[PDB]
Amino acid sequence: PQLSEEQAAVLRAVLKGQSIFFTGSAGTGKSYLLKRILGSLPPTGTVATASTGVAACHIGGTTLHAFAGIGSGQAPLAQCVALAQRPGVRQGWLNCQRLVIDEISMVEADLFDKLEAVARAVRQQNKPFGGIQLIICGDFLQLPPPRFCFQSKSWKRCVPVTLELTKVWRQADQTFISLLQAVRLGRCSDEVTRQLQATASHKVGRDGIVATRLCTHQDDVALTNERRLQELPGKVHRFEAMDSNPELASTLDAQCPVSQLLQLKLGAQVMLVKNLSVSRGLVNGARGVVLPQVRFLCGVTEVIHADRWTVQATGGQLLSRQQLPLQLAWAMSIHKSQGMTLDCVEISLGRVFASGQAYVALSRARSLQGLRVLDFDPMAVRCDPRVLHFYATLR
Ligand SMILES: Nc1ncnc2c1ncn2[C@@H]1O[C@H](COP(=O)(O)OP(=O)(O)O)[C@@H](O)[C@H]1O
Ligand code: ALF
């Protein structure tokens, strides 16, 4: 699939060597562009960062928290930069010349400046960002973190030239497309409440697949995913294989998407993966076992295997977990649901409020039939922060 003109504008400018921030509608094409950029930019200098576990596996690796070798905190630059200045953190900090980032919406502001001086102090250069080709990407109308990074003082002073993307590539029908922006900008008519309310009835989930529901908080999804599991009668089959070399919670927590324990039963809904398939990106599925041999849509069932999820712990050092790429569907968490293109989802709008959670949830659904909104979006669902002002001064 050839790139749009809007996209290829970004490609050439990063190839030029310029720090370039570009933003885009949910499904603008943003994160696919970095797939071409990372293929375009040359190993040895590129780091492939992001702000969640799930954002880094879509792209390359490393989750900012991890790569920087720090975890925000009230440690001034001093401890931070000294914590930045151990081996693995340094050696990796020094060699990079182009630092891609993704899902910048989530990174707090203070993290940026603290990350900022840290980048300079290690490299010793007093260029804007330690003189890194600093690529950035994300949409601030999706999930917040307060104080997004553009409020940070390093921002703009890093000299990023702001670019924009349009023509949403994920949803084909303009009727659905026009919907999200109405929600995105925080504007709800009935023709922004009734198209969906109408839909609530839908049946979603082709064959054996079920609607992967989305939730406001992480705990419900932990419970709701599992309650369904114990309910399903059959072989427990909870093999897992948390084969982590140390005994550290953080590696399987932040910096990778894994749970140490994968209680995969006989027929519960297994969703997501690690891409690396011509026909299977990150879609939900289930089937019989012999080695899960899981069937998702597309009608493609093959045998699934566990791999390596390399991580850099804080203060240097590398821990790695070796678990299966799959995770339990049934109810995906919404904050973990950025950077996702989900064919079939279902969400309850009514108690799910936060400058974005509305937008972010539905927008991750290709076509309207997949989206299984529930409780009427009686306005209030669509809340907004007035960050639109920043996108508004983008004359
Ligand atoms: N230039 C392009 N060529 C092919 N597919 C694209 C392009 N731009 C966007 N897409 C589609 O958009 C999806 C990725 O959406 P993306 O913009 O990365 O999500 P988000 O905007 O939420 O980060 C992919 O499935 C891909 O097929
Ligand atoms: F803006 Al995105 F996944 F990068 F919705």
From Swiss-Prot:
Localisation: Nucleus
GO MF entries: 5'-3' DNA helicase activity; 5'-3' DNA/RNA helicase activity; ATP binding; ATP hydrolysis activity; G-quadruplex DNA binding; magnesium ion binding; single-stranded DNA helicase activity; telomerase inhibitor activity
Residue positions binding ATP: 24-31
Catalysed reaction equations from the record: Couples ATP hydrolysis with the unwinding of duplex DNA at the replication fork by translocating in the 5'-3' direction. This creates two antiparallel DNA single strands (ssDNA). The leading ssDNA polymer is the template for DNA polymerase III holoenzyme which synthesizes a continuous strand; ATP + H2O = ADP + phosphate + H(+)
Keyword match ATP-binding: yes
Recorded domain comment: The PIF1 N-terminal (PINT) domain enhances the interaction with ssDNA through intrinsic binding activity, it also harbors DNA strand-annealing activity.
Protein name: ATP-dependent DNA helicase PIF1
Organism: Homo sapiens
Portion of the parent chain present: 205 to 615 of 641
